[PDB]
Amino acid sequence: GDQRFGDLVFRQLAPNVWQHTSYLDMPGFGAVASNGLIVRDGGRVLVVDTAWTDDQTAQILNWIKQEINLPVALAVVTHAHQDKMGGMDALHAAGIATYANALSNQLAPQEGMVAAQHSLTFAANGWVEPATAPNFGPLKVFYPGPGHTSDNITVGIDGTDIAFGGCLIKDSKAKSLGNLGDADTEHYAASARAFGAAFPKASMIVMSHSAPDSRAAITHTARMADKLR
Ligand SMILES: Cc1c(CP(=O)(O)O)c2ccc(Br)cc2n(CC2CCCC2)c1=O
Ligand SMILES: Cc1c(CP(=O)(O)O)c2ccc(Br)cc2n(CC2CCCC2)c1=O
Ligand SMILES: [Zn+2]
Ligand SMILES: [Zn+2]
Questions:
Q1: Which amino acid positions bind Zn(2+) 1, per UniProt?
Q2: Atom 8 in ligand 1: which residue has the minimum CA distance?
C-alpha cells in the first residue's frame, strides 16, 4: 500500500525494500513522480537516489527515522539529473556518506547539482569495483554503458527479485524514451540490453517514474533505443 508522508509516498516492495516517490509540478506535463529505493540491511538503511529537491530528500530521512529508526549508512545516486541527485545537500547536512559514478561527480556542478563525496569506478565489463563501494551489502551496482545519460548506473538487490534501471529504462507502455537531451543515441540500445543481462533473475523492474513493471519494460526500452541509431 502507498504510505503518505508529507508530500512523498513510500511503498514497501519486499521485507527489506521500499520505493520512495517525490513529485515536481511541471507546466505542460502535470505532477511528475520520481522513484528511488530504501533498503534495510543488518541494522542500517541504504538509499538509492535523492528526491527532486533538498526539502523532499530531508522528508525521506524523516520517514526513515519515524518508520524504521535505523541509521542511513550511505546513499548512491543513479545519474546527475535533478530527479535523482537534486537533494544531495540534504544527505550531506544529515552526515550521510554519498556515492555516485565518478562521471556523475564530474558532471554534477555543471548540472547545478552537488557532487557525491565518493566516486565509484567500474570494471571494463560494467560491474562496480567493490573496493569503491564498501558496505553496499545487497546493493549490486552496474554501469551498463551510456544511454539516458553518459553517467547512468543501475542497481540490483541481492536476496530479492528487484532491479532498478532508473531513467535508462521506460515502462512497457511508454510512448517514447522521454528526455534525450543528454542521451547517447549510438549506445542506448546496447546499454538497456546490458542492464537486462546484468540482472537476469530480476522479475520486478522498479521504474524511475511509474509503478514497478516486468522485464517487458527492458525489451520495450531497447526496441525504442534501436530506432535512435
Ligand atoms: C516520466 C516521463 C519523462 C522522464 P524520462 O526522461 O526519465 O523519460 C519524460 C521526459 C521527457 C518527456 Br518529452 C516526456 C516524459 N514523460 C511523458 C510526459 C508525461 C506525461 C505527458 C508526456 C514521462 O512520463
Ligand atoms: C531533466 C528533465 C527530467 C528529469 P529525467 O530526464 O532524469 O527524467 C524530466 C523528467 C520528467 C519530465 Br515529464 C520532463 C523532464 N524534463 C523536461 C523535458 C526534457 C525534454 C523536454 C522537456 C527534463 O529536462
Ligand atoms: Zn535524467
Ligand atoms: Zn527520468
A1: 79, 81, 148
A2: 178
